[PDB]
Structure 1
Amino acid sequence: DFIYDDRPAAVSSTFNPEKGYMDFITAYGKNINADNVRIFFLNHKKAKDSLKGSPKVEVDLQFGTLRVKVVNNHNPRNRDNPVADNAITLHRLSGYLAKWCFDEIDHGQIEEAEVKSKVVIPLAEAKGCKWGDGVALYLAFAPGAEMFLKDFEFYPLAIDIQRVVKDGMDITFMRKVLKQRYGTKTADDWMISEVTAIQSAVKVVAKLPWAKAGFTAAAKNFLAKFN
């Protein structure tokens, strides 16, 4: 009576990031602008702890002009609460807005210019990557980019790999990306089929500063006078 537990059932996954993205756009597309994409991408972690502190399972948030209805599972008890396929987590939202940046870029040159001039990703910065390095590569640092592997040319995967080898990141964080699809190909398929594109991606990512989150170029060229 003091503590009661109850059963979750097994299932397979009916969640298509493409569809979730489209429904998300149809639902919120009027309040999305490069300004909000930018405050969010600067407010991801802040929102991470902000959700972490609060105990409500279904919180709505405001980034500037953007209103978002998000599921909160950062809070401990909620880590196993269910999440609808039309629902949005900060991870899913992040991926979605990254996707938005990617399409918006292709829409034309004025479109190409605005976001590029106004979009920087802290996670990408901390490793010293900027837009000039590549579009797919640069946007791939956004969490949730793993949902759109093709558009980002296997770069989120490669980045995760580099995190494992150089930053000794715990291997479990590759769990999510290793379930994800490459177009029509299931994980099991592309894990053997597409090794080439992946290795190429790894190379591409390798040729990057990878500064320590991050030291302006004066560092770490000065700290290699003392070692």
Structure 2
Amino acid sequence: GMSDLVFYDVNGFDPDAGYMDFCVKNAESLNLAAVRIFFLNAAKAKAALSRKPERKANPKFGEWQVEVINNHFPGNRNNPIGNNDLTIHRLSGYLARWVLDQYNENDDESQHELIRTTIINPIAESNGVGWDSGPEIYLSFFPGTEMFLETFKFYPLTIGIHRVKQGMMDPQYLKKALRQRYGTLTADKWMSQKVAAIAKSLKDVEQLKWGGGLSDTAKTFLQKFGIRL
């Protein structure tokens, strides 16, 4: 695959092969502005697709246009999804990984500041979690990141485990993450072999500041005392 650079002759959905295909087709036309717009508008895009009868559609986010399968219109819910096809959910996962790749591309502080100020994760932010928590953990609040459990250091799973433990989520919602691979390991194999790694990941999640900042009224008050925020 993409990590060991081993290639094969041309079965089930493999998110690593899906990500490769996505990158071949889209890497050149992606930019941070477009990806920011995507993440701010993913849910709205699903809503919009839900009243469009066409089996495929071509939403545009900023300057970047992309073809997706429309599984949101009720008449289309059954239609098969191809391994190289894009859905809003798959795109969310692929773009979260693309943002991480951008972050890891170099360690200049300007790169990190650009990414931290441009990409917003509304789900993370709604929970009191910002970029300061770490890039993998921040990005793991995005839908679709469960496709890449090793990449995201088990956080797409352990966020869900934490939520269940806190009574914030029905255990059934864990089913998606629990079906995924971890690198080369199948779910049966990592559930058996990676308990320590997952526990370590969960502790990272438990230590997040689940909650937020000072109010506008408080900030205005504090400015009267020469405190600018």
Could you say which TM-score interval applies, normalised by the shorter chain? Answer: 0.7 to 0.9
Secondary structure of residue in 2 paired with 1:53: coil
1:157 aligns to what? Answer: 157
Find the residue that maps to 1:177 and give its secondary structure.
Answer: helix
Q: Distance in 2 between matches of 1:111 and 1:139?
A: 16
Deviations 1:45-93 (A, max 9, x none): 1112112222222111100111111111122232221000110001100
What secondary structure does 1:176 align onto?
Answer: helix
Query: Which residue number corresponds to residue 130 of structure 1?
Result: 130
Q: More deviation in 103-112 or 175-184?
A: 103-112
Residues 56-71 of structure 1: pairs in structure 2 closer than 5 A: 56-71=54-69
2 CA distance for matches of 1:24 and 1:123? 24
Note the C-alpha offset of 1:190.
0.3
Partners of 2:213 and 2:113 in 1: CA distance: 25
Which residue number corresponds to residue 94 of structure 1? 92
Deviation sequence 1:16-39 (CA, Å, 0-9, x none) = 111111111111222210001100
Code of the residue aligned with 1:164 in structure 2: it is V
In structure 1, what is the Cα distance between the partners aligned to 2:17 and 2:214? 42
Shift of 1:216: 4.4
Change (3 A) 1:217 1:193: farther
TM-score by length of 1: 0.84
Q: Distance in 2 between matches of 1:172 and 1:56?
A: 31
1:55 corresponds in structure 2 to 53
The whole-number CA distance in structure 2 between the counterparts of 1:92 and 1:24 is 10
Amino acid at match of 2:22: F
- Output the CA distance in 2 between the equivalents of 1:112 and 1:127: 22
Equivalent position amino acid for 1:207 in 2: Q
Which is worse superposed, 41-50 or 22-31? 22-31
Partner of 2:198 in structure 1?
A: 198
Any residues of structure 2 matched to 1:20-39 within 5 Å, and which? 20-39=18-37
Q: How far off its partner does 1:135 sit? A: 1.2
CA–CA separation in structure 2 for the residues paired with 1:129 and 1:188: 31
Name the residue aligned to 2:179: 179
SS at match of 1:136: helix
CA RMSD after TM alignment: 1.6
**2:224 alignment partner in structure 1:** none
Which residue in the other structure is 2:79 paired with? 81
| Runs of 4 or more above 3 Å deviation | 110-113, 215-218
Q: Distance in 2 between matches of 1:183 and 1:53?
A: 38
Structure 1 residue 106 displacement after superposition: 1.1
User: How many residues are treated as equivalent by the alignment?
Assistant: 203
Partners of 1:204 and 1:217 in 2: CA distance: 25
Name the structure 1 match of 2:222.
none
SS at match of 1:37: helix
Task: Note the C-alpha offset of 1:143.
Answer: 0.5
SS at match of 1:88: coil
Distance 2:64 2:167 in 1: 34
Q: Secondary structure at the match of 2:92?
A: helix
Normalization by structure 2: what TM-score? 0.83
In the alignment, structure 1 segments of 5+ residues that lack a partner are 1-12, 219-227
In 1, the alpha carbon distance for the partners of 2:198 and 2:74 equals 35
User: Could you tell me how far apart the structure 2 residues matched to 1:42 and 1:96 are?
Assistant: 15
Task: Give structure 2 stretches of 5+ with no counterpart.
Answer: 1-10, 216-229
